[PDB]
Symmetry: C3
């Protein structure tokens, strides 16, 4: 068994130490997450924001340049999968818990309260601000990490390790040293917290649906611990892959379920209004793109700092911490692809899905607010989806299917994250071990479950703050990854000819 | 000649079926017009607004691509005219009744009343919202229908028919079958209504111009029909005596008269303020482009849908319905041009016209408002050009001139458009029959009049509601054209030659 | 090479006359200046605004076009300076008295007062409206003139003269003719007034700065004169010892001082507020670029006119008149560069320095407003920097290196500008006469002085109105350059050969295709009904 302990030890130490400090000393850890938060959002907020937009310029430039004609693998190697399966796999890429949690909440919030530098009840700014958090910006980050890997791996022939994409800068000798193995630590850690966050929101939201439907009175810690345990244990099993039910038949299910949800709302809901929001969202997104990118704590006369720390800066941090996972995943399905094909696919396909989704769920929630039938309730994110569903014919049933799609996501995403996390802790092995995979998943579900307990009534608040913290170091890794990718792409063979 | 009665008849039925319904049962017609207008604007407005902007994106990307080097004709062919003569013909294409009618009215209305999403009395928004309706958007559609007809006619030797452009998707068999014919019929229907709308506006506007010159008490019904009838007959004269002699000669009048109005107002009006609106309009239009693109019934907190229906969605439908004609015209003058050079020319050249024309008329109207000398009057579009004219030295004369210009425009527009309808009904014959041509000119002017009459006090509202309803089926044609055109260009030999030299070397 | 007296005299007369009109009849000069301002802003205001943005597009299109592969010199000639030294000389270039004077004041002013079409206290608009006046728009102008001069001199091998750039429209006999000289004359007149503006600005600021350090409280003309005199003398004793030597070591102090000034206020002031304004500036700039570009006197319901002639248009005018100098400076340092390289550097680099400079100072000056610690004093630009500095731990010491800088900048600017004028009055001669250099230098300082004196209590308003009236003619020269520049690059050997190989290849391609097509028609004819 090839297990790089120099990276697995410090990684697992940070994880478990965070669990002790969380489950044991509630007040202590919940206070730490709130002051480190302010520390980062006030002193490094300008970096998350400035470079987040640089990632977008950089990535489409790389595509416009000659490096785009280059392929990922041997010279003039054909794509592994046929286009239609590459594209369809970038859908399950787009879909997920985040869109289940914020689909209704985010657009609804921005419409009601308004957004820094605009007044309340502005549909366009609501839709555009949402698109902004879920389209080009996150996937630019996913393309950077994904490319750096896919190139360092298929083309140049290195190990599928984040530290191997840093060779052009740190030398073949760095990746093997401590720095390369530090990169792999922060990679796994970021993935843990970035994934845990997802698991938290997932459980936090299902427990709410258990109350919406009256299967439960009101959720308690013993309920969230109940959900997380069933889903975690459901993961431990499926992690040790069987035959009949596989990780890629859950994606299929995820799809049909997600599709059933979306279609349902779309049809029974206000249809042409959702249709209006398609051009509506896109027009306004492009219209406000640079304004939104210019927003800082200095915006709206020194006022926007807090709104930022609860939305934009949270998402960026989250997107960063989640990059190793999504990046590696995007590499593993894009071998044989050209660098220009790869980027255009990453930036446009997932954006299609998120657009349609927020137009449906965000759209309906806003169409309710305009007709004096607010689904807002007591203003608790977790509840809002079920609020929207129960407001429509047959909405009773669809609320339960919603609970399942969430549980299957919990497990579907638990596998993917764990696998990659293992690959990164085994010197870059392709098919990781089912006993480290399952091990990482457990600690990932543990971390997540913790941030909900420590938080308590500020669980969502606590879930976010901690993410922004664990993602800060890795932010610079992704930044340097631009240079290491530029040096590599320059030292290529075709490009020299 | 070779008449395609299978096409002509179903197209001639609906038209006459409309004149009888409208001139026979005013109320039953106006009740259907206003009813359907609502179903289309409410259920399909998203479509006009989403694809209206997809068109602009599409046609620009096409030009940016390898397909751009291809030529509208045989390999390495070259243009028949100098590019200067090409530009001049596109300049003169940018003019017409629509500019006359809406040149003063539009940017004024937006300034007085304000625009959904904005405060009233906003100059930049008034102009940018106008540009939006009269530049890139309409010509992106003309370009799309032009490039399809040209590439089909000059690059592949198919008939100069719209259905021929759908060969890559429908096949040779299909383009001779029903689907192919349906496409040709919707083309002719869209052309007659989209043109009748032009003739209608013109008739209304000239009738209103008779009153401002005090040559009549009131634009009454037995006067509008008298205007249409006289101009219609003058079209017959110009039609039998060779359509060629008329169009080219009247265009001369058109450009001479038009140039006079424009320079008169430019020199006698607030010259400097008009000049400021040049970079003014361009800067704002670029600034607010995507903002305007994204506007729908959901915009402005869910309140903007009605404005949309009276403006944006109106124009889109109108540009769409007119596309077969102005596209066939764009093809017939653009052979041997490169696809890329063609796309840029069609977008930019007309834009400059509208841009200048609106800065002169709209800009002057706005300056009047600002200085407590509003020209708005009773708030009726047709009266407002004459409003602005009579507010100037010598304007009483120029008001007569603008009447003649509207008359010529009426005739050159019916000439041009009727020719294309000939071609579309004679299996793609370039020179139509002077009888099949004149036949269309009458049916068209008759529909123009049937729209005005059936309306009553709201002729304009009726003239816009029917146009939107009519143009609705053909919006989907133009959408599929995109898919058709890309399939063709992908099969083209020269471009297949470059992805052939890029798969070998690389 | 001989002095071109036919070009020298007419310029020196226009200048000397102005100095007379101003210092002789303060009340006849001020009037004409103020009446001509109106005439220009009202009638040509649209042209500055339209073409100011046209310049930006034009130069971006050139760089993107095939023209951008052409090298400014012999075919595949290597650059005189290395890539890293050239860039640095563009950093140092972008820093001037303009940055010192307006650095604090401009965004502060926009934040407090707002700009047409917006309300006060808009941080984004404050920063964006500033980027507009100090980034792409002026350096496009510079890039254009620099290119026309670099390509004309280094590639075609002509005289280093603006009249040369018009050879492809006017001819070698046109450039030697009256119009050609007229161009050079206007290029001189434009430069002296443009530099004079920068020199006046310097005096007003270094003057207010003596009264802020409480070193002088005799606020009068005998003091402003006392500054333009000492510094002018300093100019005459630097262009006499060797202008080529001073410009170097004198400039290297100009940067460390600028760097101490910058780093100081960045470290002591609201550091993470400033960092915040970096992406806040760039983003808001991109966001409002066209909205700003569309701002005319019909904007804000026919109201923006007044604000326009004090900010946007005065800057456009200022950048135009200063272009013969800046562009020539750029040409001379850019030899061996590709047109694209050059354009991409002239644009992107000075933008970096302006963006950071305005974030540090202007940003600091806005954070104070938000905290009720408002600087502004009596609302005077000339004082605001020193004001800002004083409210900082060290504002007294650093509020004096600012004094030095302004003087040092005064000298460096006068030296650089005077050289270009010499070359421009000596048939494109690189190293120009010593007494003819100091001559223009003195005369240029005389105008700046005059502008301030004829001005009175409103010295700026006068200093600006003139800079605008003296730039007007040269706006048409810069427009003409677009046409000249295109004619020239179109007849460049390397481009002609390229467009020639495109034809041959298409022709060659067509032969291969059309024949193969002929063969298939035969091969099909045999297989079918036949075989
Ligand atoms: C509204 C929605 C968003 C749309 C955003 C898209 C708009 C941007 C489009 C920009 C297209 C530019 C043209 C693309 C082709 C460029 C080809 C190119 O220059 O490649 C260079 C490579 O360029 C880069 O990778 C660096 C640039 C990356 C992007 C930086 C963006 C910074 C963003 C800051 C804000 C934006 C403004 C500044 C843009 C520069 C070549 O480098 P080299 O070979 O000289 O390097 C040798 C190496 O040093 C050897 O070791
Ligand atoms: C909604 C519209 C849908 C349209 C669907 C159209 C379907 C057909 C699209 C094309 C299919 C065939 C693709 C291959 C042929 C065309 C493309 C091609 O091969 O030509 C190249 C040439 O294309 C171009 O020159 C376009 C350059 C502009 C790209 C700018 C990047 C995007 C930034 C957007 C804003 C930028 C604005 C900057 C200035 C304001 C494109 O590659 P490249 O530009 O990445 O490479 C450059 C060089 O040739 C090879 O390295
Ligand atoms: C008015 C609206 C503005 C936004 C929308 C603009 C309209 C859309 C235009 C999109 C299509 C543009 C297509 C341009 C293709 C030009 C290609 C060409 O012919 O010249 C060369 C390509 O030209 C270039 O290299 C890029 C031009 C220089 C960089 C771009 C201009 C400077 C921009 C600086 C920023 C200033 C503007 C910022 C905001 C726009 C050929 O490419 P290459 O094979 O030499 O490229 C190799 C590459 O350099 C290395 O891989
Ligand atoms: C200040 C904002 C930025 C400026 C605006 C964007 C500027 C984009 C400039 C794009 C490059 C223009 C090059 C000019 C031609 C010089 C000679 C030349 O090099 O020819 C090339 C120039 O050819 C082009 O790239 C044509 C690009 C067409 C872009 C169309 C933009 C139209 C926008 C219209 C907007 C109208 C708005 C209305 C109000 C103004 C041919 O090569 P290619 O690039 O076609 O090759 C690519 C590929 O290998 C084969 O396709
Ligand atoms: C009508 C435009 C209104 C918008 C605002 C414009 C304000 C200025 C108007 C200037 C003319 C606008 C464009 C009018 C159509 C094109 C006119 C043109 O450019 O010349 C045409 C000739 O135009 C005319 O004879 C009638 C209109 C004349 C207006 C332009 C020429 C004016 C000549 C005197 C100008 C006086 C001032 C300058 C004197 C040097 C065509 O010449 P051609 O032989 O190349 O054309 C071949 C084509 O197939 C013919 O159909
Ligand atoms: C073809 C359609 C439009 C397309 C674009 C065409 C553009 C063609 C080029 C036009 C360039 C004109 C640039 C100068 C402005 C012209 C208008 C003008 O000068 O002011 C007008 C208006 O004049 C005024 O109201 C007063 C202006 C006073 C200007 C005084 C300037 C001289 C001041 C003396 C000192 C100058 C010192 C200069 C030192 C360099 C005078 O026009 P008008 O007399 O023909 O008509 C008057 C009005 O429209 C109707 O009665
Ligand atoms: C705007 C209102 C008044 C109208 C004024 C006139 C301007 C509008 C009309 C514009 C029509 C032409 C637009 C450009 C079309 C070029 C498209 C093209 O053909 O691609 C070529 C790209 O290359 C070029 O043709 C470039 C043009 C050659 C000269 C280059 C000049 C560049 C100058 C750029 C300055 C732009 C400044 C504007 C900025 C706002 C390569 O194909 P080709 O057919 O030219 O092949 C070459 C030859 O024909 C045989 O093969
Ligand atoms: C949103 C951006 C849109 C950009 C515009 C499209 C970009 C270009 C896309 C690439 C090429 C498009 C044209 C070809 C697409 C399909 C591939 C192809 O080559 O077409 C053939 C293969 O096409 C296909 O396999 C399926 C494509 C369907 C055919 C095209 C449909 C056009 C859609 C029009 C929508 C109008 C809606 C009307 C509703 C009443 C068609 O021949 P067929 O005999 O096989 O017929 C197709 C099928 O059997 C019919 O059932
Ligand atoms: O060569 C003729 C060929 O025609 C067939 O195509 C049919 C098939 O039904 C079908 O493949 C084809 O439609 C495919 C694309 C449909 C686009 C129709 C557009 C019409 C205009 C409005 C936009 C849409 O329509 C044709 C007519 O019904 C099939 O391609 C073959 O069976 C046959 O060989
Ligand atoms: Cl390759
Ligand atoms: Cl061809
Ligand atoms: Cl405005
Ligand atoms: Cl809105
Ligand atoms: Cl702001």
């Amino acid at each position: 068994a090839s297990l790089n302990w120099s990276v697995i030890v410090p990684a697992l130490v940070i994880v478990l130490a965070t669990v002790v400090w969380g489950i044991g000393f509630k007040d202590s850890f919940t206070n730490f997450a709130s002051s480190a938060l302010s520390a980062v959002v006030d002193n490094l907020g300008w970096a998350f924001i400035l470079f987040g937009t640089v990632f977008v310029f950089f990535i489409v430039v790389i595509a416009a340049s000659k490096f785009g004609t280059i392929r990922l693998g041997r010279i003039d190697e054909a794509p592994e999968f046929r286009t239609v399966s590459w594209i369809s796999m970038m859908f399950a890429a787009g879909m997920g818990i985040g869109l289940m949690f914020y689909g209704t909440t985010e657009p609804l919030t921005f419409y009601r309260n308004g957004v820094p530098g605009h007044d309340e009840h502005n549909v366009g700014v609501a839709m555009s601000t949402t698109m902004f958090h879920w389209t080009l910006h996150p996937w630019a980050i996913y393309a950077i990490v994904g490319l750096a890997i896919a190139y360092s791996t298929f083309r140049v022939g290195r190990k599928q390790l984040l530290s191997s994409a840093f060779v052009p800068l740190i030398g073949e000798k760095g990746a093997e040293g401590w720095l390369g193995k530090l990169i792999d630590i922060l990679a796994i850690i970021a993935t843990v917290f970035g994934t845990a966050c997802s698991l938290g929101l997932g459980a936090l939201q299902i427990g709410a649906g258990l109350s919406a439907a009256n299967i439960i009175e009101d959720p308690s810690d013993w309920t969230i611990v109940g959900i997380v345990s069933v889903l975690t244990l459901a993961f431990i099993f499926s992690a040790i892959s069987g035959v009949g039910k596989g990780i890629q038949y859950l994606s299929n299910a995820n799809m049909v379920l997600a599709a059933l949800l979306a279609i349902f709302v779309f049809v029974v809901g206000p249809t042409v209004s959702i249709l209006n929001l398609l051009p509506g969202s896109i027009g306004n997104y492009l219209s406000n793109f640079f304004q939104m990118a210019g927003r800082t704590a200095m915006s709206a006369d020194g006022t926007a700092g807090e709104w930022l720390g609860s939305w934009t800066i949270f998402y960026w941090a989250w997107w960063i911490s989640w990059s190793p996972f999504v990046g590696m995943f995007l590499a593993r399905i894009s071998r044989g692809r050209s660098i220009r094909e790869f980027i255009l696919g990453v930036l446009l396909v997932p954006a299609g899905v998120s657009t349609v989704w927020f137009s449906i769920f965000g759209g309906t929630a806003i169409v309710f607010e305009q007709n004096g039938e607010s689904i807002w309730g007591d203003g608790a994110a977790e509840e809002q989806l079920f609020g929207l569903l129960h407001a429509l014919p047959g909405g009773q049933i669809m609320g339960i299917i919603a609970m399942i799609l969430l549980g299957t996501f919990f497990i579907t995403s638990a596998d993917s994250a764990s696998t990659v996390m293992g690959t990164m802790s085994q010197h870059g092995q392709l098919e990781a071990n089912k006993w480290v995979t399952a091990a990482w998943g457990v600690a990932t579900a543990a971390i997540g479950l913790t941030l909900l307990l420590s938080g308590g009534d500020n669980a969502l608040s606590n879930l976010q703050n901690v993410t922004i913290v664990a993602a800060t170091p890795f932010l610079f890794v992704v930044i340097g990854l631009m240079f290491a990718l530029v040096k590599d792409l320059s030292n290529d063979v075709i490009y020299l000819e």
